[PDB]
Design a protein around this ligand. Sequence first.
Ligand SMILES: OC[C@H]1O[C@@H](O[C@H]2[C@H](O)[C@H](O)[C@H](O[C@H]3[C@H](O)[C@@H](O)[C@H](O[C@H]4[C@H](O)[C@@H](O)[C@H](O[C@H]5[C@H](O)[C@H](O)[C@H](O[C@H]6[C@H](O)[C@@H](O)[C@H](O[C@H]7[C@H](O)[C@H](O)[C@H](O)O[C@@H]7CO)O[C@@H]6CO)O[C@@H]5CO)O[C@@H]4CO)O[C@@H]3CO)O[C@@H]2CO)[C@H](O)[C@@H](O)[C@@H]1O
Ligand SMILES: OC[C@H]1O[C@@H](O[C@H]2[C@H](O)[C@H](O)[C@H](O[C@H]3[C@H](O)[C@H](O)[C@H](O)O[C@@H]3CO)O[C@@H]2CO)[C@H](O)[C@@H](O)[C@@H]1O
Ligand SMILES: *[C@@H]1O[C@H](CO)[C@@H](O)[C@H](O)[C@H]1NC(C)=O
Ligand SMILES: [Cl-]
Ligand SMILES: [Cl-]
Ligand SMILES: [Cl-]
Ligand SMILES: [Cl-]
Ligand SMILES: [Cl-]
Ligand SMILES: [Cl-]
Ligand SMILES: [Cl-]
Ligand SMILES: [Cl-]
Ligand SMILES: [Cl-]
Ligand SMILES: [Cl-]
Ligand SMILES: [Cl-]
Ligand SMILES: [Cl-]
Ligand SMILES: [Cl-]
Ligand SMILES: [Cl-]
Ligand SMILES: [Cl-]
Ligand SMILES: [Cl-]
Ligand SMILES: [Cl-]
Ligand SMILES: [Cu+2]
Length: 235
Amino acid sequence: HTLVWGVWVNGVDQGDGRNIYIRSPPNNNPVKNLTSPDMTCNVDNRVVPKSVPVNAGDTLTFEWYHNTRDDDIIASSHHGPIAVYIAPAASNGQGNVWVKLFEDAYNVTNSTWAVDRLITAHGQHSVVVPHVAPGDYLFRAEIIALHEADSLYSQNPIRGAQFYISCAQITINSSDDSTPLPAGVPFPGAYTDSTPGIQFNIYTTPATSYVAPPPSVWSGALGGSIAQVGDASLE
Ligand SMILES: OC[C@H]1O[C@@H](O[C@H]2[C@H](O)[C@H](O)[C@H](O[C@H]3[C@H](O)[C@@H](O)[C@H](O[C@H]4[C@H](O)[C@@H](O)[C@H](O[C@H]5[C@H](O)[C@H](O)[C@H](O[C@H]6[C@H](O)[C@@H](O)[C@H](O[C@H]7[C@H](O)[C@H](O)[C@H](O)O[C@@H]7CO)O[C@@H]6CO)O[C@@H]5CO)O[C@@H]4CO)O[C@@H]3CO)O[C@@H]2CO)[C@H](O)[C@@H](O)[C@@H]1O
Ligand SMILES: OC[C@H]1O[C@@H](O[C@H]2[C@H](O)[C@H](O)[C@H](O[C@H]3[C@H](O)[C@H](O)[C@H](O)O[C@@H]3CO)O[C@@H]2CO)[C@H](O)[C@@H](O)[C@@H]1O
Ligand SMILES: *[C@@H]1O[C@H](CO)[C@@H](O)[C@H](O)[C@H]1NC(C)=O
Ligand SMILES: [Cl-]
Ligand SMILES: [Cl-]
Ligand SMILES: [Cl-]
Ligand SMILES: [Cl-]
Ligand SMILES: [Cl-]
Ligand SMILES: [Cl-]
Ligand SMILES: [Cl-]
Ligand SMILES: [Cl-]
Ligand SMILES: [Cl-]
Ligand SMILES: [Cl-]
Ligand SMILES: [Cl-]
Ligand SMILES: [Cl-]
Ligand SMILES: [Cl-]
Ligand SMILES: [Cl-]
Ligand SMILES: [Cl-]
Ligand SMILES: [Cl-]
Ligand SMILES: [Cl-]
Ligand SMILES: [Cu+2]
């Protein structure tokens, strides 16, 4: 149970974005139904009044929280991967449009899940903005908590993988469009019951065996990290 508070750009806090530049749901409940329209941008997908300006090569940081800003972030039990996708805003997230910019699942060296590292990062994880066409975009950050993912929601609706999905309105201003955006995947649609990483038992299968759900990260993506960029408590 977690939500996005806002974003930072190049280490500068853009301010509370909830219902402003983040298409925020009313609470931190998970989405579990893989075939639901809620998989696109969570349960209250609508245009919100602002879009955060960035240029290609900037670092865009999403900041999550549980109940209040810079708290426990997400329950430790919720081990699982983190991804970020991008789609042009004209799609409203429909169709075959979401392109993966970032994936982190399990880190063998550190013996930590992406979620574990997100808590240590005070909720903060980043992507470098790609050299796509200037315009308006949706950035879809997705945490998959696997603590009940040994079951499928479609079979047992009280269990299943949990998706914590947040879409940010981002306007890319300066970019040379040297890596135009490729074909993407649909949400809902990309994840199905048979997709690797949707059903998995974190308690008996080694975490070194986990494979996150495709798609693979686009070759044009400029990477990203799970790491604190700014101190919220210094506001
Ligand atoms: O011994 C070795 C042995 O291991 C074997 O594996 C075992 C494991 O050992 C392990 O025990 C495991 O068990 C799993 C189990 O399968 C899962 O079901 C379980 O799931 C837990 C989860 O851990 C936990 O985090 C979760 O907590 C939820 C909670 O349910 C609520 O949903 C809660 O909701 C609150 C929100 O968080 C708040 O934000 C919100 O706050 C509101 C407030 O209410 C007001 O509205 C206020 O004004 O606003 C606020 C918002 O600002 O309030 C709501 C409701 O109060 O959220 C938390 C999460 O944050 O609960 C679930 C269950 O419900 O996890 C455990 C593990 O932890 O099982 C295996 C198998 O037995 C292994 O098999 C063997 O090989 C080995 O030898
Ligand atoms: O990075 C590309 C984008 O930059 C825009 O300018 C930013 C500044 O770079 C900086 O982030 C600034 O941050 C503000 C914040 O929005 C808020 O006011 C807070 O109270 O204070 C900080 C400063 O500490 O915000 C602007 C954008 O709103 C620039 O406007 C765009 O043209 C560029 O594409
Ligand atoms: C899953 O979402 C689909 C798509 O809207 C809906 O028809 C279906 O009833 C949902 N399943 C549950 C258990 O609500
Ligand atoms: Cl839960
Ligand atoms: Cl609800
Ligand atoms: Cl659901
Ligand atoms: Cl705006
Ligand atoms: Cl960076
Ligand atoms: Cl916990
Ligand atoms: Cl909790
Ligand atoms: Cl558009
Ligand atoms: Cl547009
Ligand atoms: Cl990555
Ligand atoms: Cl950190
Ligand atoms: Cl493009
Ligand atoms: Cl049932
Ligand atoms: Cl579907
Ligand atoms: Cl993986
Ligand atoms: Cl690719
Ligand atoms: Cl980064
Ligand atoms: Cu939860």
